[PDB]
Design a protein around this ligand. Structure first.
Ligand code: RET
Ligand code: RET
Lengths: 236, 236
Protein backbone atom coordinates (compact mmCIF):
# COMPACT_ATOMS: atom_id res chain seq x y z
CA UNK A 1 0.00 0.00 0.00
CA UNK A 2 2.99 2.31 -0.58
CA UNK A 3 2.13 4.58 -3.55
CA UNK A 4 4.50 5.07 -6.49
CA UNK A 5 5.16 8.62 -7.59
CA UNK A 6 5.45 11.84 -5.65
CA UNK A 7 3.13 14.58 -4.50
CA UNK A 8 4.89 17.46 -6.26
CA UNK A 9 2.03 19.86 -5.79
CA UNK A 10 1.04 18.68 -2.31
CA UNK A 11 -2.52 18.01 -3.55
CA UNK A 12 -2.53 14.57 -1.95
CA UNK A 13 -2.24 12.92 -5.40
CA UNK A 14 1.13 11.22 -5.77
CA UNK A 15 0.55 10.58 -9.45
CA UNK A 16 1.37 14.18 -10.31
CA UNK A 17 4.94 12.91 -10.61
CA UNK A 18 4.04 10.62 -13.46
CA UNK A 19 1.50 13.11 -14.77
CA UNK A 20 4.29 15.66 -14.69
CA UNK A 21 6.81 13.59 -16.65
CA UNK A 22 4.13 12.78 -19.19
CA UNK A 23 3.66 16.50 -19.81
CA UNK A 24 7.37 17.09 -20.37
CA UNK A 25 7.65 14.13 -22.73
CA UNK A 26 4.53 15.07 -24.62
CA UNK A 27 5.74 18.67 -25.06
CA UNK A 28 9.22 17.66 -26.18
CA UNK A 29 8.01 15.14 -28.71
CA UNK A 30 5.62 17.84 -29.87
CA UNK A 31 8.36 20.44 -30.24
CA UNK A 32 10.71 17.83 -31.78
CA UNK A 33 8.10 17.21 -34.44
CA UNK A 34 7.71 20.90 -35.13
CA UNK A 35 11.49 21.16 -35.34
CA UNK A 36 11.53 18.53 -38.08
CA UNK A 37 8.57 20.46 -39.50
CA UNK A 38 10.87 23.28 -40.60
CA UNK A 39 12.67 21.13 -43.15
CA UNK A 40 9.94 19.58 -45.28
CA UNK A 41 8.37 20.76 -48.52
CA UNK A 42 6.44 17.78 -49.97
CA UNK A 43 2.65 18.15 -49.78
CA UNK A 44 2.23 14.56 -48.60
CA UNK A 45 4.86 14.97 -45.88
CA UNK A 46 3.60 18.37 -44.75
CA UNK A 47 0.26 16.58 -44.40
CA UNK A 48 1.44 13.70 -42.19
CA UNK A 49 3.43 16.10 -40.08
CA UNK A 50 0.27 18.18 -39.70
CA UNK A 51 -1.83 15.44 -38.15
CA UNK A 52 0.98 13.66 -36.32
CA UNK A 53 1.90 16.90 -34.57
CA UNK A 54 -1.46 17.72 -33.09
CA UNK A 55 -1.46 14.37 -31.35
CA UNK A 56 1.53 14.88 -29.08
CA UNK A 57 0.28 18.43 -28.76
CA UNK A 58 -3.30 17.86 -27.62
CA UNK A 59 -1.80 15.29 -25.31
CA UNK A 60 0.41 17.94 -23.73
CA UNK A 61 -2.67 20.00 -23.26
CA UNK A 62 -4.45 17.14 -21.54
CA UNK A 63 -1.49 16.20 -19.40
CA UNK A 64 -0.98 19.74 -18.15
CA UNK A 65 -4.59 19.88 -16.96
CA UNK A 66 -4.38 16.62 -15.06
CA UNK A 67 -1.13 17.74 -13.49
CA UNK A 68 -2.81 20.79 -12.01
CA UNK A 69 -5.84 18.67 -11.29
CA UNK A 70 -8.05 20.20 -13.92
CA UNK A 71 -9.64 17.11 -15.45
CA UNK A 72 -10.39 15.44 -12.13
CA UNK A 73 -13.63 14.48 -10.41
CA UNK A 74 -15.18 11.86 -8.13
CA UNK A 75 -17.73 9.20 -9.03
CA UNK A 76 -19.69 7.74 -6.14
CA UNK A 77 -20.05 4.04 -6.94
CA UNK A 78 -21.46 1.57 -4.45
CA UNK A 79 -19.90 3.18 -1.38
CA UNK A 80 -16.48 4.45 -2.50
CA UNK A 81 -15.52 7.56 -4.43
CA UNK A 82 -13.41 6.73 -7.47
CA UNK A 83 -11.02 9.43 -8.66
CA UNK A 84 -11.75 9.90 -12.34
CA UNK A 85 -9.51 11.86 -14.66
CA UNK A 86 -11.74 12.82 -17.55
CA UNK A 87 -9.16 14.92 -19.37
CA UNK A 88 -7.92 11.51 -20.53
CA UNK A 89 -10.97 10.83 -22.65
CA UNK A 90 -10.93 14.32 -24.14
CA UNK A 91 -7.24 13.78 -24.87
CA UNK A 92 -8.08 10.44 -26.46
CA UNK A 93 -11.28 11.68 -28.08
CA UNK A 94 -9.07 13.47 -30.59
CA UNK A 95 -5.60 11.89 -30.36
CA UNK A 96 -6.77 8.48 -31.58
CA UNK A 97 -8.84 9.59 -34.58
CA UNK A 98 -5.82 11.55 -35.74
CA UNK A 99 -3.36 8.84 -34.86
CA UNK A 100 -5.68 6.56 -36.82
CA UNK A 101 -6.00 9.02 -39.70
CA UNK A 102 -2.24 8.76 -40.27
CA UNK A 103 -2.67 5.08 -41.03
CA UNK A 104 -5.71 5.72 -43.19
CA UNK A 105 -4.00 8.50 -45.16
CA UNK A 106 -1.01 6.17 -45.23
CA UNK A 107 -3.17 3.42 -46.72
CA UNK A 108 -5.10 5.79 -48.95
CA UNK A 109 -8.72 4.69 -48.41
CA UNK A 110 -12.04 6.29 -49.27
CA UNK A 111 -13.51 9.05 -47.08
CA UNK A 112 -16.40 6.72 -46.34
CA UNK A 113 -13.92 4.24 -44.82
CA UNK A 114 -11.99 6.81 -42.81
CA UNK A 115 -15.37 8.22 -41.81
CA UNK A 116 -16.08 4.77 -40.41
CA UNK A 117 -12.78 4.22 -38.62
CA UNK A 118 -13.20 7.52 -36.85
CA UNK A 119 -16.88 7.01 -36.16
CA UNK A 120 -16.11 3.76 -34.35
CA UNK A 121 -12.84 4.85 -32.76
CA UNK A 122 -14.76 7.80 -31.38
CA UNK A 123 -17.61 5.60 -30.17
CA UNK A 124 -14.92 3.81 -28.18
CA UNK A 125 -13.42 6.72 -26.33
CA UNK A 126 -16.85 8.12 -25.54
CA UNK A 127 -18.45 4.89 -24.32
CA UNK A 128 -15.29 4.33 -22.33
CA UNK A 129 -15.89 7.71 -20.73
CA UNK A 130 -19.46 6.58 -20.04
CA UNK A 131 -18.00 3.51 -18.40
CA UNK A 132 -15.71 5.55 -16.17
CA UNK A 133 -18.78 7.50 -15.09
CA UNK A 134 -21.25 4.60 -14.72
CA UNK A 135 -22.61 4.28 -11.18
CA UNK A 136 -23.53 0.58 -11.38
CA UNK A 137 -20.62 -1.92 -11.17
CA UNK A 138 -22.33 -4.02 -13.83
CA UNK A 139 -22.79 -0.97 -16.08
CA UNK A 140 -19.10 -0.02 -15.93
CA UNK A 141 -18.18 -3.59 -16.88
CA UNK A 142 -20.88 -3.41 -19.58
CA UNK A 143 -19.68 -0.21 -21.18
CA UNK A 144 -16.13 -1.41 -20.69
CA UNK A 145 -17.15 -4.30 -22.95
CA UNK A 146 -18.90 -2.38 -25.72
CA UNK A 147 -16.01 0.03 -25.67
CA UNK A 148 -13.64 -2.92 -26.06
CA UNK A 149 -15.82 -4.41 -28.78
CA UNK A 150 -15.31 -1.19 -30.68
CA UNK A 151 -11.61 -1.14 -29.98
CA UNK A 152 -11.48 -4.58 -31.57
CA UNK A 153 -13.52 -3.55 -34.58
CA UNK A 154 -11.16 -0.62 -35.10
CA UNK A 155 -8.18 -2.86 -34.54
CA UNK A 156 -9.89 -5.30 -36.88
CA UNK A 157 -10.05 -2.98 -39.88
CA UNK A 158 -6.46 -1.79 -39.36
CA UNK A 159 -5.19 -5.33 -39.74
CA UNK A 160 -7.41 -6.44 -42.61
CA UNK A 161 -8.94 -3.89 -44.95
CA UNK A 162 -6.22 -1.31 -44.30
CA UNK A 163 -3.34 -3.75 -44.00
CA UNK A 164 -4.29 -4.66 -47.57
CA UNK A 165 -4.47 -1.20 -49.18
CA UNK A 166 -1.06 -0.32 -47.76
CA UNK A 167 0.12 -3.71 -49.01
CA UNK A 168 -1.17 -2.89 -52.49
CA UNK A 169 1.07 0.17 -52.41
CA UNK A 170 4.87 -0.28 -52.32
CA UNK A 171 6.54 -2.46 -49.61
CA UNK A 172 8.03 0.75 -48.20
CA UNK A 173 4.54 1.97 -47.30
CA UNK A 174 3.53 -1.54 -46.28
CA UNK A 175 6.56 -2.18 -44.06
CA UNK A 176 6.00 1.16 -42.35
CA UNK A 177 2.25 0.63 -42.28
CA UNK A 178 2.44 -2.83 -40.78
CA UNK A 179 5.08 -1.74 -38.27
CA UNK A 180 3.05 1.21 -36.96
CA UNK A 181 0.02 -1.15 -37.12
CA UNK A 182 1.86 -3.71 -35.00
CA UNK A 183 2.65 -1.07 -32.39
CA UNK A 184 -0.98 0.01 -32.12
CA UNK A 185 -2.08 -3.61 -32.20
CA UNK A 186 -0.17 -3.85 -28.93
CA UNK A 187 -0.09 -0.65 -26.89
CA UNK A 188 -3.70 0.07 -27.75
CA UNK A 189 -5.05 -3.30 -26.60
CA UNK A 190 -3.27 -2.84 -23.24
CA UNK A 191 -5.50 0.13 -22.35
CA UNK A 192 -8.86 -1.54 -21.59
CA UNK A 193 -6.82 -4.08 -19.65
CA UNK A 194 -5.13 -1.51 -17.49
CA UNK A 195 -8.48 0.23 -17.32
CA UNK A 196 -10.49 -2.72 -16.04
CA UNK A 197 -7.95 -3.59 -13.31
CA UNK A 198 -7.02 -0.03 -12.34
CA UNK A 199 -9.10 2.31 -10.17
CA UNK A 200 -11.73 2.54 -12.95
CA UNK A 201 -12.29 -1.21 -12.75
CA UNK A 202 -11.15 -3.74 -10.15
CA UNK A 203 -8.89 -1.44 -8.18
CA UNK A 204 -6.27 -4.14 -8.00
CA UNK A 205 -3.69 -1.53 -9.04
CA UNK A 206 -3.01 1.81 -7.33
CA UNK A 207 -3.54 5.09 -9.21
CA UNK A 208 0.20 5.77 -9.14
CA UNK A 209 1.22 2.68 -11.08
CA UNK A 210 -1.73 3.14 -13.41
CA UNK A 211 -1.12 6.75 -14.27
CA UNK A 212 2.57 5.86 -14.68
CA UNK A 213 1.88 2.96 -16.97
CA UNK A 214 -0.74 4.98 -18.81
CA UNK A 215 1.80 7.74 -19.45
CA UNK A 216 4.36 5.19 -20.69
CA UNK A 217 1.74 3.78 -23.02
CA UNK A 218 0.64 7.27 -24.06
CA UNK A 219 4.11 8.58 -24.84
CA UNK A 220 4.92 5.47 -26.83
CA UNK A 221 1.54 5.32 -28.53
CA UNK A 222 2.00 8.94 -29.58
CA UNK A 223 5.53 10.23 -29.76
CA UNK A 224 6.96 6.81 -30.58
CA UNK A 225 4.27 6.22 -33.18
CA UNK A 226 5.14 9.44 -34.93
CA UNK A 227 8.89 8.98 -34.62
CA UNK A 228 8.44 5.74 -36.55
CA UNK A 229 6.03 7.42 -38.96
CA UNK A 230 7.69 10.76 -39.72
CA UNK A 231 10.96 8.84 -40.25
CA UNK A 232 9.55 6.43 -42.85
CA UNK A 233 9.82 7.26 -46.53
CA UNK A 234 6.13 6.33 -46.72
CA UNK A 235 5.22 9.87 -45.70
CA UNK A 236 6.67 10.92 -49.08
CA UNK B 1 -3.00 -8.52 -1.45
CA UNK B 2 -6.06 -6.56 -0.19
CA UNK B 3 -6.30 -4.38 2.96
CA UNK B 4 -8.49 -4.78 6.05
CA UNK B 5 -10.40 -1.97 7.72
CA UNK B 6 -12.63 0.50 5.94
CA UNK B 7 -12.56 3.98 4.44
CA UNK B 8 -14.84 5.52 7.10
CA UNK B 9 -14.16 8.93 5.56
CA UNK B 10 -13.99 8.09 1.87
CA UNK B 11 -10.50 9.57 1.69
CA UNK B 12 -8.66 6.51 0.37
CA UNK B 13 -7.62 5.56 3.90
CA UNK B 14 -9.12 2.30 5.20
CA UNK B 15 -6.93 2.44 8.31
CA UNK B 16 -9.32 5.04 9.67
CA UNK B 17 -11.43 2.16 10.95
CA UNK B 18 -8.72 0.97 13.32
CA UNK B 19 -7.82 4.59 14.07
CA UNK B 20 -11.48 4.84 14.92
CA UNK B 21 -11.83 1.91 17.34
CA UNK B 22 -8.56 3.12 18.85
CA UNK B 23 -9.99 6.48 19.85
CA UNK B 24 -13.18 4.77 20.90
CA UNK B 25 -11.12 2.40 23.03
CA UNK B 26 -8.52 4.87 24.23
CA UNK B 27 -11.23 7.20 25.53
CA UNK B 28 -13.23 4.32 27.07
CA UNK B 29 -10.17 3.48 29.11
CA UNK B 30 -9.20 7.04 29.80
CA UNK B 31 -12.51 8.03 31.33
CA UNK B 32 -12.80 4.66 32.94
CA UNK B 33 -9.74 5.68 34.93
CA UNK B 34 -11.37 9.04 35.68
CA UNK B 35 -14.65 7.61 36.88
CA UNK B 36 -12.74 5.08 39.01
CA UNK B 37 -10.24 7.77 39.96
CA UNK B 38 -12.30 10.21 42.01
CA UNK B 39 -13.28 8.69 45.31
CA UNK B 40 -9.66 8.09 46.22
CA UNK B 41 -9.29 9.52 49.72
CA UNK B 42 -5.61 8.60 49.41
CA UNK B 43 -2.82 10.81 48.03
CA UNK B 44 -0.30 8.27 46.76
CA UNK B 45 -2.55 6.42 44.38
CA UNK B 46 -4.21 9.70 43.44
CA UNK B 47 -0.77 10.57 42.15
CA UNK B 48 -0.82 7.41 40.01
CA UNK B 49 -4.21 7.99 38.45
CA UNK B 50 -3.20 11.55 37.56
CA UNK B 51 -0.31 10.04 35.62
CA UNK B 52 -1.90 6.89 34.25
CA UNK B 53 -4.97 8.85 33.15
CA UNK B 54 -3.01 11.11 30.82
CA UNK B 55 -1.75 8.06 28.94
CA UNK B 56 -4.93 6.87 27.14
CA UNK B 57 -5.87 10.52 27.21
CA UNK B 58 -3.06 11.96 25.12
CA UNK B 59 -3.45 8.86 22.95
CA UNK B 60 -7.21 9.41 22.50
CA UNK B 61 -6.22 12.84 21.33
CA UNK B 62 -3.69 11.44 18.89
CA UNK B 63 -5.90 8.68 17.44
CA UNK B 64 -8.65 11.21 16.94
CA UNK B 65 -6.26 13.49 15.10
CA UNK B 66 -4.91 10.66 12.99
CA UNK B 67 -8.47 9.66 12.43
CA UNK B 68 -9.10 12.88 10.58
CA UNK B 69 -5.72 12.80 8.89
CA UNK B 70 -4.18 15.45 11.09
CA UNK B 71 -0.91 13.81 12.10
CA UNK B 72 -0.39 12.41 8.61
CA UNK B 73 2.56 13.44 6.41
CA UNK B 74 3.86 12.09 3.12
CA UNK B 75 7.50 10.98 3.40
CA UNK B 76 9.19 10.52 0.04
CA UNK B 77 11.54 7.64 -0.24
CA UNK B 78 12.73 6.96 -3.73
CA UNK B 79 10.04 6.35 -6.31
CA UNK B 80 7.50 5.57 -3.53
CA UNK B 81 5.41 7.78 -1.26
CA UNK B 82 4.89 6.64 2.31
CA UNK B 83 1.91 7.74 4.41
CA UNK B 84 3.77 8.29 7.65
CA UNK B 85 1.49 9.00 10.62
CA UNK B 86 3.66 11.33 12.74
CA UNK B 87 1.06 11.81 15.43
CA UNK B 88 2.01 8.48 16.97
CA UNK B 89 5.48 9.87 17.82
CA UNK B 90 4.08 13.00 19.46
CA UNK B 91 1.76 10.62 21.36
CA UNK B 92 4.52 8.23 22.47
CA UNK B 93 6.87 11.13 23.22
CA UNK B 94 4.48 11.93 26.04
CA UNK B 95 2.77 8.66 26.92
CA UNK B 96 5.91 6.50 27.27
CA UNK B 97 7.76 8.83 29.60
CA UNK B 98 4.57 8.84 31.67
CA UNK B 99 3.92 5.13 31.47
CA UNK B 100 7.61 4.81 32.39
CA UNK B 101 7.49 7.26 35.30
CA UNK B 102 4.59 5.20 36.62
CA UNK B 103 6.98 2.31 37.20
CA UNK B 104 9.78 4.54 38.57
CA UNK B 105 7.30 5.78 41.15
CA UNK B 106 6.43 2.20 41.87
CA UNK B 107 10.09 1.73 42.69
CA UNK B 108 10.87 5.15 44.14
CA UNK B 109 14.24 6.17 42.72
CA UNK B 110 16.20 9.43 42.57
CA UNK B 111 15.55 11.95 39.80
CA UNK B 112 18.98 11.12 38.44
CA UNK B 113 17.47 7.79 37.44
CA UNK B 114 14.12 9.00 36.14
CA UNK B 115 15.82 11.91 34.38
CA UNK B 116 17.89 9.23 32.70
CA UNK B 117 15.17 6.68 32.08
CA UNK B 118 12.93 9.21 30.39
CA UNK B 119 15.86 10.99 28.79
CA UNK B 120 16.72 7.80 26.95
CA UNK B 121 13.13 6.74 26.24
CA UNK B 122 12.59 10.28 24.95
CA UNK B 123 15.58 9.96 22.67
CA UNK B 124 14.10 6.62 21.68
CA UNK B 125 11.03 8.25 20.29
CA UNK B 126 12.48 11.39 18.73
CA UNK B 127 14.95 9.22 16.84
CA UNK B 128 12.28 6.82 15.66
CA UNK B 129 10.60 9.94 14.32
CA UNK B 130 13.75 10.99 12.50
CA UNK B 131 13.64 7.57 10.89
CA UNK B 132 10.01 7.98 9.92
CA UNK B 133 10.79 11.14 7.96
CA UNK B 134 14.13 9.97 6.45
CA UNK B 135 14.47 9.82 2.68
CA UNK B 136 17.18 7.19 2.42
CA UNK B 137 16.28 3.51 2.96
CA UNK B 138 19.67 3.18 4.62
CA UNK B 139 19.07 6.15 6.91
CA UNK B 140 15.59 5.05 7.93
CA UNK B 141 17.05 1.69 8.93
CA UNK B 142 19.98 3.35 10.63
CA UNK B 143 17.84 5.52 12.86
CA UNK B 144 15.51 2.58 13.46
CA UNK B 145 18.50 0.69 14.79
CA UNK B 146 19.54 3.54 17.05
CA UNK B 147 16.04 3.95 18.41
CA UNK B 148 16.08 0.17 18.94
CA UNK B 149 19.27 0.25 20.99
CA UNK B 150 17.79 2.97 23.18
CA UNK B 151 14.68 0.87 23.66
CA UNK B 152 17.10 -1.71 25.01
CA UNK B 153 18.85 0.71 27.32
CA UNK B 154 15.39 1.62 28.63
CA UNK B 155 14.26 -1.96 28.97
CA UNK B 156 17.71 -2.62 30.45
CA UNK B 157 17.36 -0.35 33.44
CA UNK B 158 13.74 -1.39 33.97
CA UNK B 159 14.83 -5.01 34.48
CA UNK B 160 17.91 -4.41 36.63
CA UNK B 161 18.39 -1.08 38.35
CA UNK B 162 14.62 -0.66 38.90
CA UNK B 163 13.49 -4.28 38.94
CA UNK B 164 15.55 -4.75 42.10
CA UNK B 165 15.03 -1.27 43.58
CA UNK B 166 11.39 -2.31 43.51
CA UNK B 167 12.03 -5.67 45.14
CA UNK B 168 13.58 -4.03 48.18
CA UNK B 169 10.16 -2.50 48.71
CA UNK B 170 7.00 -4.52 49.48
CA UNK B 171 6.61 -7.96 47.82
CA UNK B 172 3.27 -6.69 46.70
CA UNK B 173 4.86 -3.63 45.05
CA UNK B 174 7.37 -6.02 43.51
CA UNK B 175 4.71 -8.59 42.59
CA UNK B 176 2.91 -5.91 40.58
CA UNK B 177 5.93 -3.91 39.35
CA UNK B 178 7.47 -7.05 38.04
CA UNK B 179 4.11 -7.75 36.40
CA UNK B 180 4.01 -4.36 34.71
CA UNK B 181 7.65 -4.59 33.58
CA UNK B 182 6.92 -8.04 32.10
CA UNK B 183 4.11 -6.87 29.82
CA UNK B 184 6.04 -3.66 29.08
CA UNK B 185 8.94 -5.69 27.69
CA UNK B 186 6.70 -7.95 25.64
CA UNK B 187 4.57 -5.19 24.15
CA UNK B 188 7.20 -2.50 23.69
CA UNK B 189 9.61 -4.88 21.95
CA UNK B 190 6.92 -5.58 19.37
CA UNK B 191 6.99 -2.00 18.15
CA UNK B 192 10.36 -1.76 16.33
CA UNK B 193 9.52 -5.02 14.61
CA UNK B 194 6.10 -3.91 13.47
CA UNK B 195 7.74 -0.72 12.26
CA UNK B 196 10.40 -2.54 10.28
CA UNK B 197 7.98 -4.71 8.31
CA UNK B 198 5.18 -2.18 8.06
CA UNK B 199 5.14 0.78 5.66
CA UNK B 200 7.68 2.68 7.78
CA UNK B 201 10.22 0.02 6.83
CA UNK B 202 10.28 -3.06 4.58
CA UNK B 203 6.65 -2.62 3.58
CA UNK B 204 5.93 -6.33 3.71
CA UNK B 205 2.72 -5.58 5.58
CA UNK B 206 0.05 -3.09 4.58
CA UNK B 207 -0.75 0.03 6.59
CA UNK B 208 -4.23 -1.33 7.24
CA UNK B 209 -3.07 -4.32 9.26
CA UNK B 210 -0.39 -2.13 10.74
CA UNK B 211 -2.70 0.50 12.18
CA UNK B 212 -4.64 -2.47 13.56
CA UNK B 213 -1.77 -4.23 15.30
CA UNK B 214 -0.41 -0.87 16.38
CA UNK B 215 -3.80 0.01 17.88
CA UNK B 216 -3.98 -3.25 19.75
CA UNK B 217 -0.45 -2.88 21.06
CA UNK B 218 -1.23 0.70 22.06
CA UNK B 219 -4.52 -0.03 23.83
CA UNK B 220 -2.88 -2.95 25.63
CA UNK B 221 0.36 -1.11 26.38
CA UNK B 222 -1.74 1.69 27.91
CA UNK B 223 -5.24 0.82 29.05
CA UNK B 224 -4.24 -2.74 29.90
CA UNK B 225 -1.04 -1.52 31.58
CA UNK B 226 -2.89 1.06 33.60
CA UNK B 227 -5.80 -1.12 34.58
CA UNK B 228 -3.32 -3.64 36.01
CA UNK B 229 -1.71 -0.85 38.01
CA UNK B 230 -4.81 0.89 39.33
CA UNK B 231 -6.41 -2.43 40.28
CA UNK B 232 -3.31 -3.12 42.38
CA UNK B 233 -2.68 -2.53 46.07
CA UNK B 234 0.86 -1.55 45.33
CA UNK B 235 -0.26 1.98 44.46
CA UNK B 236 -1.42 2.70 48.03
C1 RET C 1 -2.65 8.64 -27.22
C2 RET C 1 -3.70 7.71 -26.82
C3 RET C 1 -4.05 6.49 -27.39
C4 RET C 1 -3.35 5.88 -28.60
C5 RET C 1 -5.18 5.85 -26.73
C6 RET C 1 -5.75 4.70 -27.06
C7 RET C 1 -6.84 4.30 -26.20
C8 RET C 1 -7.60 3.18 -26.32
C9 RET C 1 -7.39 2.15 -27.44
C10 RET C 1 -8.60 3.03 -25.28
C11 RET C 1 -9.47 1.98 -25.17
C12 RET C 1 -10.51 1.78 -23.99
C13 RET C 1 -11.38 0.59 -24.00
C14 RET C 1 -11.30 -0.45 -25.13
C15 RET C 1 -12.40 0.35 -22.87
C16 RET C 1 -12.17 1.08 -21.55
C17 RET C 1 -11.75 2.46 -21.67
C18 RET C 1 -10.65 2.85 -22.74
C19 RET C 1 -11.07 4.29 -23.13
C20 RET C 1 -9.39 2.90 -21.84
C1 RET D 1 1.62 3.87 24.50
C2 RET D 1 2.82 3.63 23.69
C3 RET D 1 3.87 2.73 23.91
C4 RET D 1 3.95 1.79 25.10
C5 RET D 1 4.92 2.76 22.90
C6 RET D 1 6.03 2.04 22.89
C7 RET D 1 6.87 2.28 21.75
C8 RET D 1 8.08 1.73 21.47
C9 RET D 1 8.75 0.71 22.39
C10 RET D 1 8.67 2.17 20.22
C11 RET D 1 9.88 1.78 19.72
C12 RET D 1 10.46 2.22 18.31
C13 RET D 1 11.79 1.72 17.90
C14 RET D 1 12.62 0.80 18.82
C15 RET D 1 12.40 2.11 16.53
C16 RET D 1 11.41 2.58 15.45
C17 RET D 1 10.40 3.52 15.91
C18 RET D 1 9.63 3.22 17.26
C19 RET D 1 9.32 4.66 17.80
C20 RET D 1 8.36 2.58 16.71
Amino acid sequence: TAAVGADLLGDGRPETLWLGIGTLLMLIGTFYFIVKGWGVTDKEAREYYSITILVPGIASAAYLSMFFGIGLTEVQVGSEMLDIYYARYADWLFTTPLLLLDLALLAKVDRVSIGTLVGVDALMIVTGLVGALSHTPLARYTWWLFSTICMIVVLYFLATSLRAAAKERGPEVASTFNTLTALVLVLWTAYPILWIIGTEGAGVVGLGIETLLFMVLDVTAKVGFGFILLRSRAIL
